Design a protein around this ligand. Structure first.
Ligand SMILES: C[C@@H](C(=O)NC[C@](C)(O)CNC(=O)c1cc[nH]n1)n1cccc1
Ligand SMILES: C[C@@H](C(=O)NC[C@](C)(O)CNC(=O)c1cc[nH]n1)n1cccc1
Lengths: 411, 411
């Protein structure tokens, strides 16, 4: 198997329109959560979220190209283009077949679908845009990126709910490790802040309803947590075979050493109380990386601020790590970003890599009163400078689908 | 790399509610295309499609479980359960972590989304089902199958438009080949026969409008073709490591020897006139299988009945195969099934395997007047008994995303 490194990153989040601005917000403990301004939520039990603020798609695409595309595609292209520029890669005839893309989404073009349903029910099907299908389907981040950059390698898209971004990165790394590509652009994007997203997750009783204090709503492992916060944005990494990166003199951020997957086979929406599937997933990723649990310094948790999910993640970590569970640091950056759904794993992979670059564990904000059994170093309130050699990133989604990535400082 | 075999298959199609009934229809040249009965299409320019007829979800799930699930999930579970039963596999504690699932969809829960949008716009968000999100997202075929069967291996879902089923199978085979699982259930499902699907593809000018003769509408490579026919259903294969299959005495249908992927990097919806991306994809799959072009006997074409797509596929086949393009047989079973979208590749993989089992090339019906350059053996009108050692199945989707599978008779 060939070695895989991160040579470029890109991001839109509720904390900023790029990686450096987002990361500054993470290290300062800033919330990106606010009352939603783009629609009237007076009828909904949740009125707040993590929006992308002041995005200008015209930095990335012509107005012509942009009007064809759902927001989730615009977001994923923005992250993708930032990552590719950050990488310094030049696409040529000699490499274009060796560069692919894997950008996914959990829910995809839900805003576009809702707007076209309005036109459909009001006026019938003659109002539907000719770009409705290609502008709304999940694989069109991969599709549009490949067209705009001339990328002819593996072209595909994952959709594994909250695990999408984690699985997108891990399977892209697998493509490189086994020789099917030299470079992959991988990550996820999401914009599900529409009536169907807020209403759908509200009907499932999944969302925090703390409308009076939006910045306090996302509180992973806190005893007064009451559901996740819905957030929008995107993350993309340029993954590259090590020798390919070395030959062109690329800046390497970190090594992607391990990827694990598992299924709980338990319940559509609830995890097993012991987090046994998350445990098997973490162990699979450590095994894949050739690492003992004791070499892990930082975990970027799934940590969504749900009652059952957060405690099941602690139980999984205690099972995998044992006494070393009390030496590592684990935090949820969802405390600040909210839950970006299919992009969560992509942005959290970026935070894990930056934790490696900067030797700092990002905080879990809002962790006022840790719940029963939440007795690990959860980095409550303030960022923590420390030694980080190995950083792990977890995502667990609906259907019991689990993914873990393992990043290492490179040498 | 370990060897991968097909030990089980399952299907819903416009030709029948299982594999044997569907295959009987294929070999007889029967169309599954008819005026749609389940909604009023008087306002739409296309009023016909490939529906699933007389499906009883209660053969597979309780009424309780079924009411939570979009039709595309019901379809994918039905195919999946048929495939698993067909395989004879017994799931135990010793193997459950080694059995995963990869069932995708191009469009996913579009019917559910449209019905919930009606409730939303009429009555506000209190009408939205609590099962709306878990019952509508694409990864819930994989999710529900894993829960119902206790499968704890890799759990994920592809969404690559018309390539979904092809990519789902090929990446599941990759998981087995490189030791991440012993068994995978892989395929795709689709039910996009709603106002948004028919209206969306109609707005894109993608659909045949031959409402006067629905059974003649799908006519791949015919000079009077005018777009594809939208169809519903599902296909699932049980993929298994060879030694695992041999040890339990499984019936092996065929070997999955090759998988190729490529991106055109050309256009969101149009292929390059020379089919250069499809050419690279086929070559990648043959290279992967260790096969010369001359060993290919049967191609199950993408062959959707579009002007540009069908001729670009011929040009790709002539480029890859050369003079051997005139010795192989190539047909589109979309002539009879229509275009099942994200399930197309799954059902077509099953037809390719059965072409191997039965030594018969299925027909391209409706091929009355082959267009300029469509001078290969396209199996016009009637099934053709012949030697088939190697069968190839193509899918090409929006975004320029391409996949090819290569199946071989097993020994
Ligand atoms: C019960 C709750 C929830 O939090 N579910 C979590 C989920 C989606 O199953 C994913 N798994 C984990 O978080 C996890 C943690 C350790 N092992 N698995 N809910 C959400 C929506 C409706 C109810
Ligand atoms: C132009 C036409 C169409 O048929 N497009 C085909 C597509 C979706 O690009 C996939 N590629 C191939 O069929 C192919 C064949 C050989 N190489 N690629 N259309 C569809 C919807 C709107 C217009």
């Amino acid at each position: 198997r060939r070695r895989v490194v991160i040579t470029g990153m890109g991001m839109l989040s509720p904390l900023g329109l790029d990686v450096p601005s987002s990361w500054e917000g993470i290290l300062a403990g800033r919330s990106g959560i606010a009352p939603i301004e783009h629609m009237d939520l007076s009828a909904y039990s949740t009125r707040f979220g993590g929006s992308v603020k002041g995005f200008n798609v015209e930095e990335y695409l012509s107005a012509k190209e942009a009007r064809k595309l759902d927001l989730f595609i615009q977001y994923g292209l923005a992250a993708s283009f930032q990552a590719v520029r950050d990488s310094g890669l030049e696409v040529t005839d000699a490499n274009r077949e060796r560069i692919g893309v894997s950008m996914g989404s959990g829910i995809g073009g839900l805003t576009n679908i809702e707007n076209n349903c309005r036109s459909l029910f009001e006026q019938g099907p003659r109002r539907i845009s000719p770009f409705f299908v290609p502008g709304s389907i999940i694989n069109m981040v991969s599709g549009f990126l490949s067209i705009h950059l001339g990328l002819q390698g593996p072209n595909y898209a994952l959709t594994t709910a909250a695990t999408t971004g984690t699985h997108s990165i891990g399977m892209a790394a697998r493509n490189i490790a086994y020789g099917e590509a030299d470079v992959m652009v991988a990550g996820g994007s999401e914009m599900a802040a529409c009536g169907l997203g807020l209403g759908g997750f509200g009907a499932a009783r999944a969302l925090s309803t703390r409308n009076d204090e939006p910045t306090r709503a996302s509180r992973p492992w806190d005893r007064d947590r009451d559901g996740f916060v819905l957030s929008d944005g995107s993350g993309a990494l340029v993954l590259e075979e090590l020798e390919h990166a070395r030959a062109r003199g690329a800046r390497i951020y970190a090594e992607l050493v391990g990827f694990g997957m598992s299924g709980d086979a338990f319940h559509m929406t609830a995890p097993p109380e012991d987090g046994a599937g998350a445990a098997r997933c973490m162990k699979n990723a450590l095994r894949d990386a050739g690492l003992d649990p004791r070499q892990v310094d930082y975990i970027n948790a799934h940590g969504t601020s749900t009652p059952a999910g957060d405690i099941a993640e602690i139980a999984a970590v205690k099972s995998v790590f044992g006494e070393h569970a009390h030496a590592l640091s684990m935090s949820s950056t969802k405390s600040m970003t909210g839950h970006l759904l299919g992009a969560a794993g992509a942005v959290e992979a970026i935070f894990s890599v930056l934790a490696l670059r900067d030797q700092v564990a990002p905080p879990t904000i809002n962790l006022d009163n840790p719940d029963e059994g939440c007795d690990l170093d959860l980095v409550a309130h303030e960022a923590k400078p420390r030694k980080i050699d190995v950083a792990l990133s977890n995502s667990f989604g609906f259907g019991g689908t689990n993914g873990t990535l393992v990043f290492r400082r490179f040498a």
